[PDB]
């Protein structure tokens, strides 16, 4: 059940990809740590809720 | 955003001076840095982008 992922290495030792291992010990997922591997998304639903979304080089009002 | 009447017209200079010199007191000095000349008209709003110009990677 071990889960293996690559670390995003910031300061590299003078010694390439480094990994870390995770194992869940409990049946209830609420007990689990946070994966912190979070996908992002477009702001458009907030920055552009327009029915006709227009392109920035064209006149906003036409 | 210009919230004046439609019969009102005008041209405005909006600017950005990167650090290190005297903060602008005259249009003459402001012209010399990053700037947009905004013409008021049917498109009511103007956008000036302040480009990331820094020495450090994070301020």
């Amino acid at each position: 059940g071990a889960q293996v992922s690559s670390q995003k290495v910031g300061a590299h030792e003078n010694s390439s990809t480094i990994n870390y291992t995770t194992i869940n010990y409990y049946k209830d997922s609420a007990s689990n740590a946070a994966s912190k591997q979070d996908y992002s998304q477009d702001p458009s639903k907030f920055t552009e809720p327009l029915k006709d979304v227009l392109i920035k080089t064209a006149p906003a009002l036409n | 955003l210009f919230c004046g009447s439609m019969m009102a017209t005008g041209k405005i200079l909006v600017a950005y001076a990167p650090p290190g010199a005297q903060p602008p007191t005259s249009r003459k000095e402001a012209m010399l840095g990053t700037h947009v000349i905004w013409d008021l008209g049917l498109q009511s709003s103007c956008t000036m982008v302040v480009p990331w110009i820094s020495n450090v990677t994070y301020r």
Partner: protein, 279 residues
């Protein structure tokens, strides 16, 4: 293998090749080996530079601060119910000197905290075991005015809760510099005086200093409400640089440090008396 080069067997010479002569004016160190100037035997070399690698040189937890905090009846005059320390390697001299063989560095930092305590007075009853809160306050964040005010709520600042008697506390910090490397030396100013300034204090700055708060502070307190009897505690902070890289070598500090910059004051006489022709 990481052993050093073997010594080559070298015999007599009568030639136009002269390794022994050179000109240091060029800026260069003469690349000579024993076999360039004396007859040598073959030696299979097994020695290595494993312990003098940059990581191995700094791979040791060094004492950078002694923070003192009291736990006692909150009276009404300047007390030590909580304490603050600006994070630095400059309050101590030993690690400071080691880091300063180099102009720039880049590394992750490991902090270990040894906490000791004792009874301040002859006797008023005793004290139940104490829990300590070590809170990091990054620049910009509200600093505490009182040992139990809202800032200790620590919702976003990282805090360590240490139980007295437990194994010394330990955390790791990423490389957190605003630049691509840490500057151990900065020949400059944070501000420039301009000809058009009102007072000439507007543009005044400390030589060599960069940001006002550098990296923030560690605020320390005893979470326990006070016992009747006073308990005094000291938190010793040990710092170790790990996953280390360094650039541009420098001469080591030869005279005693005098504050956070390169300033010297006295004991400017590092070298002993020895006669020119005395072994």
């Amino acid at each position: 293998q990481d052993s050093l080069p073997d010594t080559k067997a070298s015999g007599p010479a009568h030639s136009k090749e002269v390794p022994a002569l050179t000109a240091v004016e060029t800026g260069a160190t003469n690349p000579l080996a024993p076999s360039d100037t004396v007859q040598t035997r073959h030696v299979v070399q097994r020695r290595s530079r494993s312990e003098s690698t940059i990581e191995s040189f700094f791979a040791r937890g060094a004492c950078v601060a002694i923070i003192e905090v009291d736990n006692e009846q909150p009276t009404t005059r300047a007390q030590k119910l909580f304490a603050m320390w600006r994070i630095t390697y400059k309050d101590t001299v030993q690690l400071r000197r080691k880091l300063e063989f180099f102009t720039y560095s880049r590394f992750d930092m490991e902090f270990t905290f040894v906490v000791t305590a004792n009874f301040t007075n002859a006797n008023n009853g005793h004290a139940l075991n104490q829990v300590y809160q070590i809170m990091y306050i990054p620049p910009g964040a509200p600093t505490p005015k009182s040992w139990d005010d809202y800032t200790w709520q620590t919702s976003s600042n990282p805090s360590i809760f240490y139980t007295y008697g437990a194994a010394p506390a330990r955390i790791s910090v990423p490389y957190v510099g605003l630049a691509n490397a840490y500057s151990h030396f900065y020949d400059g100013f944070a501000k420039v005086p301009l000809k058009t300034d009102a007072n000439d204090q507007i543009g005044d700055s400390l030589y060599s200093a960069m940001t006002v708060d550098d990296f923030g502070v560690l605020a320390v307190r005893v979470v326990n409400d006070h016992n009747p009897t006073k308990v005094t505690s000291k938190v010793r902070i040990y710092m170790k640089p790990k996953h280390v890289r360094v650039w541009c070598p420098r001469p080591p500090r030869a005279v005693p440090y005098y504050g956070p910059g390169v300033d010297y004051r006295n004991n400017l006489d590092p070298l002993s008396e020895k006669g020119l022709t005395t072994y």
